[PDB]
Amino acid sequence: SMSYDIQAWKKQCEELLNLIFQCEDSEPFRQPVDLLEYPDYRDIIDTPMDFATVRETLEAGNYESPMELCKDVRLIFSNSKAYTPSKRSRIYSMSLRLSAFFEEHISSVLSDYKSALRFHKRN
Numbered sequence: 001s002m003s004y005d006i007q008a009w010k011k012q013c014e015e016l017l018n019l020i021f022q023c024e025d026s027e028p029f030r031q032p033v034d035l036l037e038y039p040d041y042r043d044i045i046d047t048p049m050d051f052a053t054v055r056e057t058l059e060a061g062n063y064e065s066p067m068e069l070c071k072d073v074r075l076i077f078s079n080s081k082a083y084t085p086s087k088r089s090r091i092y093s094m095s096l097r098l099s100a101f102f103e104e105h106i107s108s109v110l111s112d113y114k115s116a117l118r119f120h121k122r123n
């Protein structure tokens, strides 16, 4: 049961998203971009993504693994680099800080999940 629990990642990701929502650096990324108030957003960005959407996808049970959740979170940050590419921008700096924060904390979630998969496959 608890060692190598292949479902433990879900609550760990719920907790990491709570930390992200607390971060002042997440303010621009908490909700979808208003496509009326930024009419050129979709001219640039193919697939919008934001932390409320990630949080709801997880709650609905629509991620099969923490790697699928990580892919959507990384899309938030690649979308930000595409839409706000200037390294002079304070929004660029916020995006980089929050991405480093997410990458640090998701690392062990992924590592542990993959170790658990390997153990159950072996046995």
Ligand SMILES: CC(C)Cc1nc(C#N)c(N)o1
Binding pocket: 028, 033, 038, 083, 084, 089, 091, 092
């Ligand atoms: C976060 C975007 C949806 C909109 C947006 N406002 C700014 C500013 N200021 C920027 N770099 O990008």
